[PDB]
Amino acid sequence: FDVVSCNKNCTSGQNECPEGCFCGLLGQNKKGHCYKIIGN
Numbered sequence: 001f002d003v004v005s006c007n008k009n010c011t012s013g014q015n016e017c018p019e020g021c022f023c024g025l026l027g028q029n030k031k032g033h034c035y036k037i038i039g040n
Helices: none
Strands: 002-011 031-038
Touching: none
Parallel strands: none
Antiparallel strands: 002 031
16 A cells, blocks of 8 residues: 555545545545555
8 A cells, every 4th residue: 555646636525636536635624635545
């Protein structure tokens, strides 16, 4: 497991990322940044 950013800003109630990426948003308080999981 390595984690990298996917260079996209996400918002609470929307969670916009490009497909294959997801956002580790902090309990859906306000906003976060999208990540990609790569590994085994």
